[PDB]
Symmetry: D2
Subunit: 198 residues, 4 copies
C-alpha cells in the first residue's frame, strides 16, 4: 500500500517563501488524495490484469499516470525543499551544472524558463540523462512523472500547478519561481545526483 510521506519540516517552515496555508493544503489535501486514489487505481488494475481485460487496463491509464505521477512528483518535491535551503550546491553537482549550463545562474534562468513556460498545470525538472551522461532540463504536463515518461532521473522539481502558488503569488508565477530558490535543498538534490553516479 502506497502511503503519504510525512513532511521533513513543519507547514510553516518555508515561510515567507511558500506560506503555511499553501504547504498545509498541498500536503494534507492534494498529495493525500493522489495517494488514496492511486491505491484504488492499482487495485482495479490487478483485477483487470488477472482477467486479461485489456480494455479496462487501457481505460485505467489516465487515473494511474495522474495519481501515480502525483504521488511520485510530490514525494520528491517535499525532499527537494528545506527551511535551511537556498544558496548553491558544491562539488560534482556544481561542476556538472557549470559544465552543462555554463554557470549556476544560467541554470537557474533555464529551469525558471522551463517552469514559467508550462501552459496550464505541470512541473519543471532538472534531471539526469543516463544515456548521455549529463544534466538535462525538462517540463512535464499535469502529473506526468519525469522518469516514467522521459526516462530522465529526477533531481529537482518545481511544481507549477496553481495550487502550488496562487494563494500567495496570485497570477504572477515568476514571483513564485523567484522565491522558491531560497528554499531549495541542494543537499538532497546533490544526493539524488550522486545516486546516478555510474
Amino acid at each position: 500500500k502506497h502511503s503519504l510521506p510525512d513532511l521533513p519540516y513543519d507547514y510553516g517552515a518555508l515561510e515567507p517563501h511558500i506560506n503555511a496555508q499553501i504547504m498545509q493544503l498541498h500536503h494534507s489535501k492534494v498529495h493525500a488524495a493522489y495517494v488514496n486514489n492511486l491505491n484504488v487505481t492499482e487495485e482495479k488494475y490487478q483485477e483487470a490484469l488477472a482477467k486479461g481485460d485489456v480494455t479496462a487496463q487501457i481505460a485505467l491509464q489516465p487515473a494511474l499516470k495522474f495519481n501515480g505521477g502525483g504521488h511520485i512528483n510530490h514525494s520528491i518535491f517535499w525532499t527537494n525543499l528545506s527551511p535551511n535551503g537556498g544558496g548553491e550546491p558544491k562539488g560534482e553537482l556544481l561542476e556538472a551544472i557549470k559544465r552543462d549550463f555554463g554557470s549556476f545562474d544560467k541554470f537557474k534562468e533555464k529551469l525558471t524558463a522551463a517552469s514559467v513556460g508550462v501552459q496550464g498545470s505541470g512541473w519543471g525538472w532538472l534531471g539526469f540523462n543516463k544515456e548521455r551522461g549529463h544534466l538535462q532540463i525538462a517540463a512535464c504536463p499535469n502529473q506526468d512523472p519525469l522518469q516514467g515518461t522521459t526516462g530522465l532521473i529526477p533531481l529537482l522539481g518545481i511544481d507549477v500547478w496553481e495550487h502550488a502558488y496562487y494563494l500567495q503569488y496570485k497570477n504572477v508565477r515568476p514571483d513564485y519561481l523567484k522565491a522558491i530558490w531560497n528554499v531549495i535543498n541542494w543537499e538532497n538534490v546533490t544526493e539524488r545526483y550522486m545516486a546516478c553516479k555510474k
Copy 2:
C-alpha cells in the same frame, strides 16, 4: 486588435458563490494577459505567413491556441454568469436538455461530472452539435477552445483551472461546481442556443 471585454457586472456581484478576489484577478489579470499575449502572437504569425515561414508558423501554434483560446473561453464565461443567474432555463433550451440528458438535474450532474473530471487545467462545456442537431457535453484541456478544437458551438462553459476557485474552495472542486450553478446566466445560454437554431 483584440481587446479585454468589460465584465457585465462588478467584481463582487457573484458573491458569495465566486468571491470578489477571484473575479478581480481572473478578469483584470488572467484574461488580460491572454488578450495582450494573443495580439503579440497574431502579429508574429502575419510576419511568418508573409515570409512563408512554415516552421515559425508551427512554432507559434501553442501560443496562438493557448492565448487565443484563453480569450475566447473567458469572453464567453463572463457572459455565462450573472448576479441574477441560477434556476433553470425555459422553452426550447429546457426541452432540449430534457430530450438529450433526461432531465435538467441529470444534465447538471453530467456537466458537473465532466468539469470535476478534468485532470489538471481545463474547462467543462455544454455545447451544440450542428451536424447531429443536439446538445453535447465536452471537456477541453488548458485553454483549448470548444469550437476551434471540437466544432461544437459553446453554450455554457465552466472554468476549472485552479485560478478559478482555489482561493475560495481550495482543493474541493466539487464545492465550486456546487456553487456556480447559482450564478449561471440561463438567459445568455438560451440566447447562444437559439443562435444555432437552424
Copy 3:
C-alpha cells in the same frame, strides 16, 4: 495469455476488394506482433504492480495501449468483414442508422469522411454511446482502442493504417474506403449492436 485468433475466412476471400497479400501480412505478421508484444508487456506490468513500482507501470503504458489496442482493434476488424458481405444492414440497426445519421448513404459519408480524415495512422469507427443511447462515429489514432479511450462500444471499424491498403491502393485511401463497403459483415455489426442495446 492472449492469442492470435484465426481469420473467419481464407486470406484471399475478400478479393478483389482487399487482396490476399494484404490480408495474409495483416493477420500473420502485423496482428501477430501486437499479440506477442502485448503478452510481453502485460507480464512486465504484473511484475511492476507486484513491486508497487509506479514509475515502471507508467513507463509501460505506451506499449500496453499500443499493443493491447492493436490486439483489440484487429480482433474486431476481422469479424466486421466477410466474403459474402456488402449491401446494407436490416432491422433495428438500419433504423438506428437512418435515425442517427439521416440515411444509410449519409452514414457511409460520415464514416468514410472520419476514416479518410485520419492524419497519420489510425481507425475510423461506428460505435454505440450507451450514455446517450445512440450511434456515434469516432476516429482513433494509432492503435488507441475505441472503448478503452472513448467509452463507446465498437460496432464497425475501418483500419486506415497504410499497411491496411498501401500495397493495393497506394496513396489513394478513398479508393480503399470505397472498396471496403463491399465486404462489411453487417451480420456481425448487427450482433455487436443488439449486444449493447439490450
Copy 4:
C-alpha cells in the same frame, strides 16, 4: 506559394536500397499532396487572421502542422539521400558524433532505435541543439516537424511512415532502416551541421 522541389536524382537512383516505385510515389503523390494542401491551408489562415477569427485560426492548426510539416520533412529527406551515399561522414561532423554518441556505430544504433521505436507514423531525426551546442536524436510523430516542434535543427531524417517502406520491406521496418544507411548523403548532413554550428 509553396512548391514541390524536384528530386536531386532519378526515382530509381537509390536502388536497390529504396526501390523506384516507392520513390516515385513518395515524391510525386505523397509529398505533392502535402504541398497542395499546405497552400490551401495557408491561404485560409490569411483570411482568418485578416478577420481576427481566432476560432478559425485554431481549427486550421492540425492541417497547417500536418501539411506544412509534411512539406518541410520531405524536402529535407530528399537532400539527405544520394545514389553515391553511404559510408561514414568526416571531419567535424564525425568528431561531434563519436563525441556525443561514443562512436559512429553507437550513433547508428541510437538513430535506428529511435526510428524503429516510432509507434504509428513518424520520423527519426539526428538534430542539433543550439542551446547545449551538441547533437541530439529525437523522434517526431506523424508530420510534426523537428524544428517547429522541438527547436532542434534537422541534420538527418529517417521517414518511418509505412508508405516509405511497406511496398518493399513490408512490415519489417528494421530491414528498411538497415538498407537506408547505404544511401545517406553525408555531404548534405555535413552542410546542415556546419550551417548551424557557425
